[PDB]
Subunit: 430 residues, 3 copies
């Protein structure tokens, strides 16, 4: 049976790394509603005009989406204006960051891990294949008005932004609480990260070798850990399917003698063709409207993700959020962002307690008619003596008048025990 | 008239409980577009195929929603992997939790309060009535392709999750800052919750009886307080209305001689029936598309709520958020989650100051040419003497050299007063 | 080259003000689907009924949006129940708030800045022009079923709410951590805002004149700084465009002999008119459905913004969020909300470090075989002597036994230096 004076306190700990993947953006596309609905046909074009402004409005809606996609990327990545140069030391206290930092030997300045992500995530190809030089109208005709737009920010630009966000200000002064995760005086920076989670400084300095070894090992595990990227792979598959719908639907003779305008204008009287053409226009218009509606709703989902990604970057990467399970499970220490196809990947570094054991505890200690409360932390018994220590790491200290405060009375507190508080001044007087 | 040296400090306080209700999920449904649009008719089916892939795509969209609904529930509740057993003490320091914990005597292991919520919130019935054994195709035909899907997680499973989230780790070691709201050494756990809002430990230990009495009373009020659940009742009513739309619309002869396929095929020539059938297909398709669009938009709303509910659970239940009015109005102490039909209910426990009175204050005290600033809290005057105390509870202490720090000069600070700081060492030297 | 013992510490600072603009709400509108689709025509009305409940459902959807718009406003502004009176001092320690507080001499009780916003942001007019007395049906007919609804809360009411939120509780007791940004004992309130960002109290009291001067200057800059409000101007333009779509589309003879019902009923046989009318109904219905869909999606965007605005108000205005870049860039001190057309404007006051210089640092100091760690802050070298100071403002203090704690050993910490720790008791013993 469990009693009401038993506290579990960790005697050891480990450092772990978890991965979060967010779908910041999606491929920018545009559909020319006039070319999609009507091909090389004057009769179709004139009939389409008689249906009013539906076509024009749809172009507007899709354009707005394409613009938002660049806004999303900028809000997430364009937060730092640093250039980012090259660190001439390559040693941050035994810590290995060579796998998260840009590799100078590569064509594209990506880190090893970023490259793993890049080569993992796989209509758009066909459009890309018809182009290469700068003929967009030619391809648009081949693809029935469906075109693909370039991003505002290229892969190289994003890599530069993440290099600035991750490290940036390596050289020219450490900023303990006002800058990127990676800076030269790393051992100290960490000391003020442990403190931020209720772990005193000595814990880091006395265990630098163990901690660095655990950290370096954790990174290696991430490379093998990386399924995994299905969350971003889904982005491409979902968008490709939507485009496939538009293309296939053009072959549907929606109550029509055919799906080909030329086979309606030919071998058919004027008013007969007008009716058949109108039927195809009505169906193709309905199809396009369905597509656009789906894109508007989907785009909203990606916008929400982009906002979250930007928020987490500010609070997890360029800060130390204390929100539970917000920057990963456990006690947040830091985050190292990485670029990825259509999204951002965060490597969250957290502190995890280990090897807990229950010790006997008490509310307060009665010294001489007065109740002494712990200034910080808890009181624990090792079976023969009472000590005062912290909650996130077991390290008993002698209970003295400088570790407690006095309030109320011995006869008021219920869980009061009889122990002795040490007065450090008496030996100095004598 | 008010002066510029008047600070209001609470001399008393109360503990209050507020209720938050969130619509985490909605009933999972599915519509067979082929059966809905076309019944037992070959002619209708063939004509529907001529309209392309519209029907297929709509099935896809609705299926995606049904899946998301289980994801939403899992993100909110499936955060803890504890089993949750039975506490053999039933006494947490005079605190009564019998009304929030599962009742062993019930068929369904719900708490008393959970049961109140369960029996408060009230097409779906009719479908449920035709089934009972496992005949789904038979009902689907009766209900024109409209069917209802079961949840991944049953009510019993949710009750178990909330039991783990609320308490879970009652026996086998208290985890002061790394576990559920309810653990055996409750009086102490609370001490470190009061501290978390700037209220020193003695406040709790000297007032355990009053605090427990207020807490127990507050819970009783909640039972009578529980309108109230309209927020979740709306979920059922909104969804039922949407389904009613689809059913009723089938009776609309949208520019047709009838709304019954059999009355079109009968007493009508082949090409005449084809036209009339196409008109009904076009209308029924438009109706179904309207329905699906509404479900996609609505589903997005519920997804946002589920994400918020999950976030609050992590930060309010399995932590102590300091975000203002995030976990309820006042100073957050803890939260006790409860299950509910189509949602989650949070009972937020907050600290509320009472019986404030304004005292005269000052920036700093001049002792001997040097300005002494409060180490923590404020300086106050009782009319004849100056004392130092905290801000969230009035408890005057003697101003000593250990309660202040020295900076600047007496002649620099504007709101400087002439008082005396007590030096605790002199009596020891003499 | 940079070394691994260099810390940049600010020797000066400035106070800055940034502006955030949020689109809380949008104009409430309603469309009478029956009047829009069918004008003064019995034949059109009867044919519309034959299409079922589409028309009715659309009215429902738009109504729901109009209601949500008032909910959005209430959640953001209706958080405080104070009356707000008049401060008879007009002096908060040299700080000038006359430009953010309501001006008693104006017809509408707005602040100067609020008035700048009001007169900056510019179908709806035409409807507003036909009315003035309370004839809504007359205008509705003139505008083809398109009407405009009044807000629940008028401009005056909002101004009163923001006056309560900004100041409210000026007279009758200061509430250091439980009330609005503006209260009489401002110099002290600020002291506990600087402390909240790791800046000790003396920093404010010794620099009141400089700080007040910077603050007052910053406000003047905002007036000239106020493009700018494009974010809210877009709200009107986007909504106006959507309404223009509905109006223009009524002129489209969507496969019809005309767009005028009277020109179809006249000079045409009964069954011929029925067909032509049905074509117009189908197009006008499709147009209305398109409009409503766009409004539902757009409304969701504004709902998200309203929720964010309300959240920030609680955490930024009625609190001191520590979330990075959440309440503005830099260290958050306070926020002063202002009303605006269709939205809310926040003036964020932040602390920004200035004039940094790198000092030489070290992990710990070895005194006599034992390692002394800083109780708070960092150790720095001025080139000849070691001092201990804080991180957000350079102010060296003598390193004493009361500024450090002892842990581990001299021979364990790597970055250990040989310095002397001062013992303050020896001079008292002698
Ligand atoms: C805390 O846990 C770590 C990891 O288990 C312990 O480090 C291991 O110590 C053993 C014995 O010296 C070595 O053989 C292993 O190689 C170490 N592992 C690693 C990754 O270095 C550490 O000793 C434990 N600390 C305490 C106080 O028990
Ligand atoms: C940091 O990690 C990198 C990558 O794991 C290490 O580089 C590898 O070192 C081994 C051993 O010499 C070689 O066999 C591999 O071929 C190297 N890989 C690459 C990509 O160069 C690097 O040595 C580690 N540095 C430290 C200080 O631990
Ligand atoms: C609780 O801690 C105390 C202090 O470390 C332990 O007492 C010491 O035990 C060591 C090892 O036998 C002796 O060399 C010291 O002289 C003892 N000091 C004192 C003041 O007695 C004590 O044994 C521990 N209790 C338990 C159950 O482990
Ligand atoms: C803690 O110390 C107090 C004070 O010495 C103890 O209380 C006394 O106990 C004796 C023996 O039962 C009584 O005769 C005295 O009258 C008590 N004095 C008071 C003021 O109560 C107390 O029992 C000790 N507690 C423990 C656990 O040792
Ligand atoms: C703080 O407020 C509480 C609640 O009003 C006070 O508790 C009451 O005290 C009176 C007088 O002893 C009793 O008759 C009531 O029954 C108590 N109420 C409850 C719920 O127990 C408490 O005394 C006040 N504290 C102070 C210092 O004034
Ligand atoms: C905790 O609350 C429960 C429910 O209010 C209390 O149980 C009730 O006790 C009264 C008085 O004996 C009975 O008349 C009711 O019939 C009981 N209700 C139920 C559901 O059992 C319980 O006694 C309270 N326990 C404590 C320690 O306060
Ligand atoms: C301010 O507090 C002081 C200290 O409690 C009060 O002075 C004491 O008053 C009591 C009751 O008359 C006396 O028994 C003590 O001897 C007094 N102590 C001292 C040092 O004078 C003082 O009266 C309070 N002032 C007001 C206005 O309430
Ligand atoms: C606080 O103490 C200071 C120092 O004793 C007082 O300042 C002196 O006041 C006398 C009388 O007006 C003057 O003659 C001295 O020249 C002043 N000395 C200085 C350095 O200013 C001060 O007035 C006292 N304040 C209060 C409120 O008692
Ligand atoms: C911190 O920066 C402020 C602003 O630059 C300095 O204030 C200026 O000081 C000069 C010299 O006395 C005056 O001529 C300017 O008019 C002041 N500016 C303002 C706005 O008042 C301040 O002196 C600097 N502090 C330190 C220690 O260097
Ligand atoms: C606070 O700011 C207001 C507005 O800038 C100041 O009022 C202006 O004062 C100047 C100088 O006397 C006049 O020329 C302007 O016409 C005034 N404007 C208005 C709207 O009244 C006010 O004096 C400032 N107060 C303080 C203490 O700085
Ligand atoms: C580091 O700070 C110390 C203490 O202020 C400086 O030493 C003082 O310098 C002043 C000006 O020359 C002398 O009047 C004091 O007597 C010195 N005090 C001591 C203990 O030497 C020291 O010069 C500063 N070092 C540097 C490089 O600026
Ligand atoms: C800090 O003080 C220690 C202790 O005096 C110094 O260590 C000694 O240095 C001398 C000279 O090299 C050696 O002969 C002793 O054997 C060392 N003693 C120990 C325990 O190591 C240390 O060198 C000093 N460091 C600095 C930077 O002054
Ligand atoms: C609860 O604590 C009291 C006081 O120490 C003790 O007497 C009682 O046995 C404890 N309960 C259990 C089940 O151990
Ligand atoms: C608590 O004590 C029990 C009994 O010794 C033990 O089985 C359990 O593992 C302890 N809890 C922790 C966290 O060590
Ligand atoms: C503001 O404080 C000063 C200094 O104590 C005082 O002289 C003045 O009367 C106070 N103002 C009011 C209205 O009381
Ligand atoms: C502040 O003082 C006035 C005057 O005595 C009083 O009416 C008011 O209630 C006091 N404020 C508080 C919070 O007690
Ligand atoms: C890093 O710190 C060590 C120890 O003080 C020093 O010897 C080394 O030169 C420093 N590295 C650089 C590049 O200054
Ligand atoms: C760091 O030192 C270098 C070299 O003197 C200097 O150029 C740089 O400005 C310093 N960093 C800061 C923040 O002052």
């Amino acid at each position: 049976a469990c009693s009401n004076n038993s506290i579990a306190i960790p005697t050891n700990f480990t450092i772990s790394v978890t991965t979060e993947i967010l779908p910041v953006s999606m491929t920018k596309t545009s559909v020319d509603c006039t070319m999609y609905i009507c091909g090389d046909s004057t009769e179709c074009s004139n009939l389409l005009l008689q249906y009013g402004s539906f076509c024009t409005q749809l172009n507007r809606a899709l354009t707005g989406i394409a613009v938002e996609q660049d806004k999303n990327t900028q809000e997430v990545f364009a937060q730092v204006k640093q250039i980012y140069k090259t660190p001439p030391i390559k040693d941050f206290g035994g810590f290995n960051f060579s796998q998260i930092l840009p590799d100078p030997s590569k064509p594209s300045k990506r880190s090893f891990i970023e490259d793993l992500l890049f080569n993992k995530v796989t209509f758009i190809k066909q459009y890309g294949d018809c182009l290469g030089d700068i003929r967009d109208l030619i391809c648009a005709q081949k693809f029935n008005g469906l075109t693909v737009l370039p991003p505002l920010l290229t892969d190289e630009m994003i890599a530069q932004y993440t290099s600035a966000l991750l490290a940036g200000t390596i050289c020219s002064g450490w900023t303990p609480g006002a800058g990127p995760p990676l800076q030269i005086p790393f051992p100290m920076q960490m000391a003020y990260r442990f403190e931020g989670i209720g772990v005193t400084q000595n814990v880091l300095y006395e265990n630098q070798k163990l901690i660095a070894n655990q950290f370096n090992s954790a990174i290696g595990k991430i490379q093998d850990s990386l399924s995994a990227l299905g969350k971003l792979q889904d982005v491409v598959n979902q968008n490709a399917q939507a485009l496939n719908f538009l293309v296939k639907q053009l072959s549907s003779n929606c109550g029509a003698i055919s799906s080909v305008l030329n086979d309606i204008l030919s071998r058919l009287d004027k008013p007969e063709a007008e009716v058949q053409i109108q039927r195809l226009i009505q169906c193709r218009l309905q199809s396009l409207q369905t597509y656009v509606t789906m894109m508007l709703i989907r785009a909203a989902e990606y916008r929400a993700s982009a906002m979250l990604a930007a928020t987490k970057m500010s609070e997890c990467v360029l800060g130390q959020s204390k929100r539970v399970d917000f920057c990963g499970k456990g006690y947040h220490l830091m985050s190292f962002p990485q670029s990825a196809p259509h999204g951002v990947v965060f490597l969250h570094v957290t502190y995890v307690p280990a090897q807990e054991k229950n010790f006997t505890t008490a509310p307060a200690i009665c010294h001489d008619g007065k109740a002494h409360f712990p200034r910080e932390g808890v009181f624990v018994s090792n079976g023969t003596h009472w000590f005062v220590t912290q909650r996130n790491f077991y390290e008993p200290q002698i209970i003295t008048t400088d570790n407690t405060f006095v309030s109320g009375n011995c006869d008021v507190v219920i869980g009061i025990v009889n122990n002795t508080v040490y007065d450090p001044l008496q030996p100095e007087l004598d």
